[PDB]
Amino acid sequence: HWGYGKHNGPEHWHKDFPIAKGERQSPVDIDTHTAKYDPSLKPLSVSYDQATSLRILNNGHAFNVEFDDSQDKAVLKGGPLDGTYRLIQFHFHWGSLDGQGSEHTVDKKKYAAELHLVHWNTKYGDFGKAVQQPDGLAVLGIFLKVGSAKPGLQKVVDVLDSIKTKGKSADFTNFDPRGLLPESLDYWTYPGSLTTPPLLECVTWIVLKEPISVSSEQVLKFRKLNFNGEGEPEELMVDNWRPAQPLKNRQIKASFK
Ligand SMILES: [Zn+2]
């Protein structure tokens, strides 16, 4: 099955998922000088006050914090988006070392990790229908750098011991994703894809300019997770990022001057 090792990692994915070589793949390098300021772009509207987290899952490639997406409770709108996108889950990608881990890069800079808040367009009714549409998802990407601790991340860090291995889940109610946001909602946006199989070209990417800071101790706990299932040979869950893909015929737009 696909993964992040030398025999099943990103350079192999195209054999099972030929869209891996498609025209709108993610992530990409954000060349800050080439991104065009678009005064038509609206402020992002992030409405997470009624978010209902339910559960955290180690799925063997990352961990997902899952939300109740059966009502407009945690929604993204505005920015580059038409209509309303409901939060279904967030997860991270991270490195073995602080010098790598992000999927998007900024002028070729790699951050220690990247948070993806995944939302689906309510006009398609369910996530599975949304991923079949070119405007089906909006993923809000937030870079992580190592420095000060992020207090709002610690509840996530502290439950990871209970989901060490693939297939483990834990109740994870009352988690407020507002505690993972930076101060500024300035962003870049472009049309792209899921960054894991099935690599569907269904995402409007919204990447925040301002990173969040997390502590060395917080990211070190991400790196204690396992890709393997319980009672299998230990394979640390590190370097679960896809590198930058060709931009092809795309424009990256900036919300800010
Ligand atoms: Zn992701």
PDB file of C-alpha atoms and ligand atoms in Angstrom:
ATOM      1  CA  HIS A   1       0.000   0.000   0.000  1.00  0.00           C
ATOM      2  CA  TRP A   2       1.099   3.622  -0.437  1.00  0.00           C
ATOM      3  CA  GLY A   3       3.075   5.381   2.298  1.00  0.00           C
ATOM      4  CA  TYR A   4       6.252   7.496   2.847  1.00  0.00           C
ATOM      5  CA  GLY A   5       9.071   4.798   2.594  1.00  0.00           C
ATOM      6  CA  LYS A   6      11.653   4.298  -0.324  1.00  0.00           C
ATOM      7  CA  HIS A   7       9.511   1.562  -1.931  1.00  0.00           C
ATOM      8  CA  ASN A   8       5.981   3.103  -1.416  1.00  0.00           C
ATOM      9  CA  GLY A   9       6.542   6.883  -1.050  1.00  0.00           C
ATOM     10  CA  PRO A  10       5.455   9.836  -3.187  1.00  0.00           C
ATOM     11  CA  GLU A  11       7.569   8.928  -6.285  1.00  0.00           C
ATOM     12  CA  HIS A  12       5.638   5.590  -6.470  1.00  0.00           C
ATOM     13  CA  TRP A  13       2.086   6.923  -6.013  1.00  0.00           C
ATOM     14  CA  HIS A  14       1.487   7.551  -9.744  1.00  0.00           C
ATOM     15  CA  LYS A  15       1.431   3.766 -10.443  1.00  0.00           C
ATOM     16  CA  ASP A  16      -1.830   3.299  -8.466  1.00  0.00           C
ATOM     17  CA  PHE A  17      -3.031   6.935  -8.759  1.00  0.00           C
ATOM     18  CA  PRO A  18      -2.053   8.272 -12.206  1.00  0.00           C
ATOM     19  CA  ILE A  19      -3.534  11.736 -11.375  1.00  0.00           C
ATOM     20  CA  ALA A  20      -0.316  12.096  -9.293  1.00  0.00           C
ATOM     21  CA  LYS A  21       1.162  13.534 -12.566  1.00  0.00           C
ATOM     22  CA  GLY A  22      -1.933  15.747 -13.188  1.00  0.00           C
ATOM     23  CA  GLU A  23      -2.324  19.428 -13.979  1.00  0.00           C
ATOM     24  CA  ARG A  24      -3.363  20.659 -10.509  1.00  0.00           C
ATOM     25  CA  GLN A  25      -1.400  18.654  -7.947  1.00  0.00           C
ATOM     26  CA  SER A  26      -0.513  19.793  -4.428  1.00  0.00           C
ATOM     27  CA  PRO A  27       1.492  20.869  -2.573  1.00  0.00           C
ATOM     28  CA  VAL A  28       3.460  23.559  -4.444  1.00  0.00           C
ATOM     29  CA  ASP A  29       6.221  26.014  -3.687  1.00  0.00           C
ATOM     30  CA  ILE A  30       4.773  29.491  -3.078  1.00  0.00           C
ATOM     31  CA  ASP A  31       7.059  31.966  -4.825  1.00  0.00           C
ATOM     32  CA  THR A  32       6.192  35.104  -2.831  1.00  0.00           C
ATOM     33  CA  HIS A  33       7.494  37.514  -5.463  1.00  0.00           C
ATOM     34  CA  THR A  34       5.389  35.877  -8.295  1.00  0.00           C
ATOM     35  CA  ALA A  35       2.146  35.537  -6.290  1.00  0.00           C
ATOM     36  CA  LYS A  36      -0.178  38.310  -7.352  1.00  0.00           C
ATOM     37  CA  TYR A  37      -1.964  40.525  -4.844  1.00  0.00           C
ATOM     38  CA  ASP A  38      -5.665  40.251  -5.752  1.00  0.00           C
ATOM     39  CA  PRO A  39      -7.705  43.138  -4.301  1.00  0.00           C
ATOM     40  CA  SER A  40     -10.912  41.179  -5.271  1.00  0.00           C
ATOM     41  CA  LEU A  41     -10.082  38.468  -2.641  1.00  0.00           C
ATOM     42  CA  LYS A  42     -12.231  38.779   0.491  1.00  0.00           C
ATOM     43  CA  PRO A  43     -11.196  38.312   4.103  1.00  0.00           C
ATOM     44  CA  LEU A  44     -11.416  34.687   5.168  1.00  0.00           C
ATOM     45  CA  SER A  45     -14.416  33.948   7.437  1.00  0.00           C
ATOM     46  CA  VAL A  46     -13.485  31.207   9.930  1.00  0.00           C
ATOM     47  CA  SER A  47     -16.550  30.436  12.136  1.00  0.00           C
ATOM     48  CA  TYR A  48     -15.455  27.709  14.606  1.00  0.00           C
ATOM     49  CA  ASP A  49     -17.359  28.904  17.775  1.00  0.00           C
ATOM     50  CA  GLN A  50     -19.852  25.935  17.504  1.00  0.00           C
ATOM     51  CA  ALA A  51     -17.278  23.317  16.414  1.00  0.00           C
ATOM     52  CA  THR A  52     -17.931  19.825  17.867  1.00  0.00           C
ATOM     53  CA  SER A  53     -14.858  17.656  17.884  1.00  0.00           C
ATOM     54  CA  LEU A  54     -15.623  13.996  18.411  1.00  0.00           C
ATOM     55  CA  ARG A  55     -12.600  11.738  18.062  1.00  0.00           C
ATOM     56  CA  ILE A  56      -8.896  11.445  17.198  1.00  0.00           C
ATOM     57  CA  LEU A  57      -7.694   8.637  14.912  1.00  0.00           C
ATOM     58  CA  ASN A  58      -4.250   7.301  13.929  1.00  0.00           C
ATOM     59  CA  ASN A  59      -4.993   6.248  10.327  1.00  0.00           C
ATOM     60  CA  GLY A  60      -1.450   4.965   9.617  1.00  0.00           C
ATOM     61  CA  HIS A  61      -0.387   8.131   7.678  1.00  0.00           C
ATOM     62  CA  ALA A  62      -1.219  10.900  10.209  1.00  0.00           C
ATOM     63  CA  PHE A  63      -3.718  11.496  13.002  1.00  0.00           C
ATOM     64  CA  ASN A  64      -7.092  13.073  12.247  1.00  0.00           C
ATOM     65  CA  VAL A  65      -9.107  15.158  14.753  1.00  0.00           C
ATOM     66  CA  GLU A  66     -12.681  14.542  13.520  1.00  0.00           C
ATOM     67  CA  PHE A  67     -15.664  16.855  13.806  1.00  0.00           C
ATOM     68  CA  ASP A  68     -19.410  16.515  13.629  1.00  0.00           C
ATOM     69  CA  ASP A  69     -20.109  17.767  10.065  1.00  0.00           C
ATOM     70  CA  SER A  70     -23.882  16.882  10.106  1.00  0.00           C
ATOM     71  CA  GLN A  71     -24.829  20.643  10.521  1.00  0.00           C
ATOM     72  CA  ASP A  72     -23.244  24.046   9.609  1.00  0.00           C
ATOM     73  CA  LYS A  73     -21.358  24.199  12.976  1.00  0.00           C
ATOM     74  CA  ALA A  74     -17.715  24.935  11.996  1.00  0.00           C
ATOM     75  CA  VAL A  75     -17.586  26.610   8.594  1.00  0.00           C
ATOM     76  CA  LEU A  76     -15.181  28.390   6.303  1.00  0.00           C
ATOM     77  CA  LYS A  77     -16.435  30.961   3.798  1.00  0.00           C
ATOM     78  CA  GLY A  78     -15.323  34.149   2.105  1.00  0.00           C
ATOM     79  CA  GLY A  79     -11.709  34.422   1.047  1.00  0.00           C
ATOM     80  CA  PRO A  80     -11.642  32.979  -2.507  1.00  0.00           C
ATOM     81  CA  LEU A  81     -14.664  30.708  -1.831  1.00  0.00           C
ATOM     82  CA  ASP A  82     -18.226  30.765  -3.172  1.00  0.00           C
ATOM     83  CA  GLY A  83     -20.674  29.375  -0.574  1.00  0.00           C
ATOM     84  CA  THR A  84     -20.086  27.459   2.644  1.00  0.00           C
ATOM     85  CA  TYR A  85     -17.567  24.762   3.529  1.00  0.00           C
ATOM     86  CA  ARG A  86     -17.980  22.564   6.622  1.00  0.00           C
ATOM     87  CA  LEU A  87     -15.042  21.389   8.762  1.00  0.00           C
ATOM     88  CA  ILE A  88     -14.742  17.563   8.726  1.00  0.00           C
ATOM     89  CA  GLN A  89     -11.238  16.978  10.189  1.00  0.00           C
ATOM     90  CA  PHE A  90      -7.796  18.411  10.740  1.00  0.00           C
ATOM     91  CA  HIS A  91      -4.420  16.697  10.649  1.00  0.00           C
ATOM     92  CA  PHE A  92      -0.726  17.557  10.319  1.00  0.00           C
ATOM     93  CA  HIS A  93       2.284  16.624   8.219  1.00  0.00           C
ATOM     94  CA  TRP A  94       5.703  16.783   9.925  1.00  0.00           C
ATOM     95  CA  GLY A  95       9.352  15.899   9.663  1.00  0.00           C
ATOM     96  CA  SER A  96      11.989  13.764  11.349  1.00  0.00           C
ATOM     97  CA  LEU A  97      13.978  17.052  11.921  1.00  0.00           C
ATOM     98  CA  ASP A  98      12.803  20.658  12.451  1.00  0.00           C
ATOM     99  CA  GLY A  99      14.222  21.601   8.999  1.00  0.00           C
ATOM    100  CA  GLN A 100      11.546  19.682   7.067  1.00  0.00           C
ATOM    101  CA  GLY A 101       7.944  18.558   7.430  1.00  0.00           C
ATOM    102  CA  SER A 102       5.744  21.051   5.599  1.00  0.00           C
ATOM    103  CA  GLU A 103       4.120  20.191   2.276  1.00  0.00           C
ATOM    104  CA  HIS A 104       3.828  23.702   0.912  1.00  0.00           C
ATOM    105  CA  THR A 105       7.058  25.691   0.890  1.00  0.00           C
ATOM    106  CA  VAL A 106       7.562  29.480   0.825  1.00  0.00           C
ATOM    107  CA  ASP A 107      10.417  30.593  -1.456  1.00  0.00           C
ATOM    108  CA  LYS A 108      11.665  26.976  -1.009  1.00  0.00           C
ATOM    109  CA  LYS A 109      11.595  27.290   2.828  1.00  0.00           C
ATOM    110  CA  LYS A 110      10.349  24.132   4.543  1.00  0.00           C
ATOM    111  CA  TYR A 111       8.607  24.527   7.894  1.00  0.00           C
ATOM    112  CA  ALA A 112       8.761  21.919  10.679  1.00  0.00           C
ATOM    113  CA  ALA A 113       5.111  20.915  10.084  1.00  0.00           C
ATOM    114  CA  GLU A 114       1.882  21.939   8.379  1.00  0.00           C
ATOM    115  CA  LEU A 115      -1.699  21.824   9.746  1.00  0.00           C
ATOM    116  CA  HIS A 116      -4.544  21.067   7.306  1.00  0.00           C
ATOM    117  CA  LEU A 117      -8.108  21.997   8.326  1.00  0.00           C
ATOM    118  CA  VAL A 118     -10.256  20.136   5.781  1.00  0.00           C
ATOM    119  CA  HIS A 119     -13.683  21.478   4.749  1.00  0.00           C
ATOM    120  CA  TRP A 120     -16.265  20.298   2.171  1.00  0.00           C
ATOM    121  CA  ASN A 121     -18.630  22.405   0.061  1.00  0.00           C
ATOM    122  CA  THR A 122     -22.172  22.058   1.453  1.00  0.00           C
ATOM    123  CA  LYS A 123     -23.635  22.320  -2.079  1.00  0.00           C
ATOM    124  CA  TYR A 124     -22.494  18.650  -2.675  1.00  0.00           C
ATOM    125  CA  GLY A 125     -24.180  17.272   0.463  1.00  0.00           C
ATOM    126  CA  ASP A 126     -21.395  14.871   1.694  1.00  0.00           C
ATOM    127  CA  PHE A 127     -17.565  14.734   1.713  1.00  0.00           C
ATOM    128  CA  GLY A 128     -17.521  11.716  -0.657  1.00  0.00           C
ATOM    129  CA  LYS A 129     -19.544  13.615  -3.294  1.00  0.00           C
ATOM    130  CA  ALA A 130     -17.517  16.812  -2.725  1.00  0.00           C
ATOM    131  CA  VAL A 131     -14.155  15.154  -3.556  1.00  0.00           C
ATOM    132  CA  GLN A 132     -15.531  14.373  -7.059  1.00  0.00           C
ATOM    133  CA  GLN A 133     -15.890  18.123  -7.815  1.00  0.00           C
ATOM    134  CA  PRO A 134     -13.277  20.732  -8.742  1.00  0.00           C
ATOM    135  CA  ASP A 135     -14.618  23.104  -6.040  1.00  0.00           C
ATOM    136  CA  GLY A 136     -15.504  20.339  -3.578  1.00  0.00           C
ATOM    137  CA  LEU A 137     -13.021  21.057  -0.736  1.00  0.00           C
ATOM    138  CA  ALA A 138     -11.302  24.007   0.914  1.00  0.00           C
ATOM    139  CA  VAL A 139      -8.198  23.140   2.912  1.00  0.00           C
ATOM    140  CA  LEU A 140      -6.811  25.796   5.246  1.00  0.00           C
ATOM    141  CA  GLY A 141      -3.067  25.221   5.601  1.00  0.00           C
ATOM    142  CA  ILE A 142      -1.087  26.652   8.513  1.00  0.00           C
ATOM    143  CA  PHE A 143       2.693  26.342   8.898  1.00  0.00           C
ATOM    144  CA  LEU A 144       4.318  25.326  12.188  1.00  0.00           C
ATOM    145  CA  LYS A 145       7.755  26.574  13.279  1.00  0.00           C
ATOM    146  CA  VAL A 146       9.562  25.416  16.436  1.00  0.00           C
ATOM    147  CA  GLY A 147       9.910  28.036  19.174  1.00  0.00           C
ATOM    148  CA  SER A 148       7.391  28.913  21.893  1.00  0.00           C
ATOM    149  CA  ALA A 149       4.724  26.312  22.770  1.00  0.00           C
ATOM    150  CA  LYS A 150       1.224  26.636  21.280  1.00  0.00           C
ATOM    151  CA  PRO A 151      -0.980  26.299  24.368  1.00  0.00           C
ATOM    152  CA  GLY A 152      -4.037  25.342  22.269  1.00  0.00           C
ATOM    153  CA  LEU A 153      -2.131  22.354  20.764  1.00  0.00           C
ATOM    154  CA  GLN A 154      -1.239  20.681  24.070  1.00  0.00           C
ATOM    155  CA  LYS A 155      -4.581  18.772  24.441  1.00  0.00           C
ATOM    156  CA  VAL A 156      -3.814  17.122  21.071  1.00  0.00           C
ATOM    157  CA  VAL A 157      -0.187  16.345  22.068  1.00  0.00           C
ATOM    158  CA  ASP A 158      -1.254  14.762  25.361  1.00  0.00           C
ATOM    159  CA  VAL A 159      -3.733  12.257  23.764  1.00  0.00           C
ATOM    160  CA  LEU A 160      -1.159  10.924  21.225  1.00  0.00           C
ATOM    161  CA  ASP A 161       0.172   8.312  23.700  1.00  0.00           C
ATOM    162  CA  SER A 162      -3.336   6.691  23.517  1.00  0.00           C
ATOM    163  CA  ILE A 163      -3.307   6.421  19.646  1.00  0.00           C
ATOM    164  CA  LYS A 164       0.339   5.427  19.127  1.00  0.00           C
ATOM    165  CA  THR A 165      -0.354   2.878  16.401  1.00  0.00           C
ATOM    166  CA  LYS A 166      -2.389   2.617  13.206  1.00  0.00           C
ATOM    167  CA  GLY A 167      -6.112   2.036  13.759  1.00  0.00           C
ATOM    168  CA  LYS A 168      -6.224   3.335  17.371  1.00  0.00           C
ATOM    169  CA  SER A 169      -8.781   6.085  18.126  1.00  0.00           C
ATOM    170  CA  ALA A 170      -9.764   8.005  21.301  1.00  0.00           C
ATOM    171  CA  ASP A 171     -12.718  10.177  22.273  1.00  0.00           C
ATOM    172  CA  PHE A 172     -11.692  13.784  21.700  1.00  0.00           C
ATOM    173  CA  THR A 173     -14.607  16.030  22.490  1.00  0.00           C
ATOM    174  CA  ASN A 174     -14.694  19.785  23.256  1.00  0.00           C
ATOM    175  CA  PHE A 175     -11.470  20.602  21.404  1.00  0.00           C
ATOM    176  CA  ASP A 176     -11.527  24.186  20.094  1.00  0.00           C
ATOM    177  CA  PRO A 177      -9.597  24.514  16.788  1.00  0.00           C
ATOM    178  CA  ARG A 178      -9.543  28.329  17.214  1.00  0.00           C
ATOM    179  CA  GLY A 179      -6.537  27.662  19.513  1.00  0.00           C
ATOM    180  CA  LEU A 180      -4.471  26.532  16.465  1.00  0.00           C
ATOM    181  CA  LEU A 181      -4.912  29.750  14.410  1.00  0.00           C
ATOM    182  CA  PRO A 182      -2.286  32.505  14.064  1.00  0.00           C
ATOM    183  CA  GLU A 183      -3.203  36.162  14.630  1.00  0.00           C
ATOM    184  CA  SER A 184      -3.405  37.133  10.921  1.00  0.00           C
ATOM    185  CA  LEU A 185      -5.681  35.492   8.333  1.00  0.00           C
ATOM    186  CA  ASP A 186      -3.615  36.847   5.409  1.00  0.00           C
ATOM    187  CA  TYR A 187      -3.321  34.042   2.848  1.00  0.00           C
ATOM    188  CA  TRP A 188      -2.240  32.695  -0.495  1.00  0.00           C
ATOM    189  CA  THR A 189      -4.687  30.666  -2.593  1.00  0.00           C
ATOM    190  CA  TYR A 190      -4.526  28.390  -5.643  1.00  0.00           C
ATOM    191  CA  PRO A 191      -6.436  25.427  -7.122  1.00  0.00           C
ATOM    192  CA  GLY A 192      -4.949  22.043  -6.250  1.00  0.00           C
ATOM    193  CA  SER A 193      -5.415  18.549  -4.964  1.00  0.00           C
ATOM    194  CA  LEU A 194      -5.446  16.217  -2.009  1.00  0.00           C
ATOM    195  CA  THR A 195      -1.796  15.653  -0.999  1.00  0.00           C
ATOM    196  CA  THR A 196      -2.338  11.933  -0.247  1.00  0.00           C
ATOM    197  CA  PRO A 197      -3.949   9.247  -2.383  1.00  0.00           C
ATOM    198  CA  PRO A 198      -6.400   9.424  -4.023  1.00  0.00           C
ATOM    199  CA  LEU A 199      -4.786  12.823  -4.969  1.00  0.00           C
ATOM    200  CA  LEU A 200      -8.121  14.121  -6.318  1.00  0.00           C
ATOM    201  CA  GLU A 201      -8.047  17.574  -7.931  1.00  0.00           C
ATOM    202  CA  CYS A 202     -10.891  18.929  -5.780  1.00  0.00           C
ATOM    203  CA  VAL A 203      -9.229  21.472  -3.434  1.00  0.00           C
ATOM    204  CA  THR A 204      -9.179  25.244  -3.182  1.00  0.00           C
ATOM    205  CA  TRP A 205      -6.003  25.702  -1.102  1.00  0.00           C
ATOM    206  CA  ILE A 206      -5.877  28.601   1.360  1.00  0.00           C
ATOM    207  CA  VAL A 207      -2.387  28.799   2.952  1.00  0.00           C
ATOM    208  CA  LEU A 208      -1.916  31.308   5.782  1.00  0.00           C
ATOM    209  CA  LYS A 209       1.171  33.523   5.620  1.00  0.00           C
ATOM    210  CA  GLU A 210       1.656  33.698   9.397  1.00  0.00           C
ATOM    211  CA  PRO A 211       2.952  30.437  10.920  1.00  0.00           C
ATOM    212  CA  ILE A 212       2.128  29.265  14.425  1.00  0.00           C
ATOM    213  CA  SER A 213       4.904  28.474  16.891  1.00  0.00           C
ATOM    214  CA  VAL A 214       4.956  25.095  18.665  1.00  0.00           C
ATOM    215  CA  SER A 215       7.606  23.904  21.098  1.00  0.00           C
ATOM    216  CA  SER A 216      10.324  21.338  20.383  1.00  0.00           C
ATOM    217  CA  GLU A 217       8.637  19.126  23.019  1.00  0.00           C
ATOM    218  CA  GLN A 218       5.255  19.310  21.204  1.00  0.00           C
ATOM    219  CA  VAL A 219       6.670  18.279  17.797  1.00  0.00           C
ATOM    220  CA  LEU A 220       8.876  15.597  19.458  1.00  0.00           C
ATOM    221  CA  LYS A 221       5.604  13.967  20.651  1.00  0.00           C
ATOM    222  CA  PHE A 222       4.254  13.938  17.068  1.00  0.00           C
ATOM    223  CA  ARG A 223       7.454  12.024  16.127  1.00  0.00           C
ATOM    224  CA  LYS A 224       6.751   9.271  18.741  1.00  0.00           C
ATOM    225  CA  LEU A 225       3.650   8.147  16.810  1.00  0.00           C
ATOM    226  CA  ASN A 226       3.898   4.989  14.697  1.00  0.00           C
ATOM    227  CA  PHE A 227       2.920   4.246  11.109  1.00  0.00           C
ATOM    228  CA  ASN A 228       2.645   0.514  12.069  1.00  0.00           C
ATOM    229  CA  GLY A 229      -0.193  -1.220  13.915  1.00  0.00           C
ATOM    230  CA  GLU A 230       0.147  -2.584  17.499  1.00  0.00           C
ATOM    231  CA  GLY A 231       2.515  -5.609  17.776  1.00  0.00           C
ATOM    232  CA  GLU A 232       4.209  -4.766  14.434  1.00  0.00           C
ATOM    233  CA  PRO A 233       7.854  -3.651  13.978  1.00  0.00           C
ATOM    234  CA  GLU A 234       8.089   0.014  15.104  1.00  0.00           C
ATOM    235  CA  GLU A 235       8.219   2.540  12.219  1.00  0.00           C
ATOM    236  CA  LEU A 236       8.153   6.107  13.577  1.00  0.00           C
ATOM    237  CA  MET A 237       5.498   8.335  11.968  1.00  0.00           C
ATOM    238  CA  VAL A 238       7.869  11.028  10.603  1.00  0.00           C
ATOM    239  CA  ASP A 239       8.344  12.622   7.187  1.00  0.00           C
ATOM    240  CA  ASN A 240       4.667  12.109   6.232  1.00  0.00           C
ATOM    241  CA  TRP A 241       4.812  14.986   3.711  1.00  0.00           C
ATOM    242  CA  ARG A 242       4.591  15.058  -0.081  1.00  0.00           C
ATOM    243  CA  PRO A 243       7.137  17.360  -1.688  1.00  0.00           C
ATOM    244  CA  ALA A 244       6.237  20.319  -3.911  1.00  0.00           C
ATOM    245  CA  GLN A 245       4.718  19.418  -7.298  1.00  0.00           C
ATOM    246  CA  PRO A 246       4.905  21.317 -10.590  1.00  0.00           C
ATOM    247  CA  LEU A 247       2.799  24.502 -10.645  1.00  0.00           C
ATOM    248  CA  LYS A 248       1.904  24.008 -14.359  1.00  0.00           C
ATOM    249  CA  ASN A 249      -0.781  26.415 -15.608  1.00  0.00           C
ATOM    250  CA  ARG A 250      -1.659  27.936 -12.187  1.00  0.00           C
ATOM    251  CA  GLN A 251      -1.576  31.292 -10.522  1.00  0.00           C
ATOM    252  CA  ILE A 252      -1.082  31.733  -6.788  1.00  0.00           C
ATOM    253  CA  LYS A 253      -2.986  34.791  -5.499  1.00  0.00           C
ATOM    254  CA  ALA A 254      -2.203  36.767  -2.326  1.00  0.00           C
ATOM    255  CA  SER A 255      -4.907  38.365  -0.130  1.00  0.00           C
ATOM    256  CA  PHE A 256      -2.369  40.974   1.111  1.00  0.00           C
ATOM    257  CA  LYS A 257       0.019  43.628  -0.300  1.00  0.00           C
TER     258      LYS A 257
HETATM  259 ZN    ZN B   1      -2.879  17.116   4.689  1.00  0.00          ZN
END
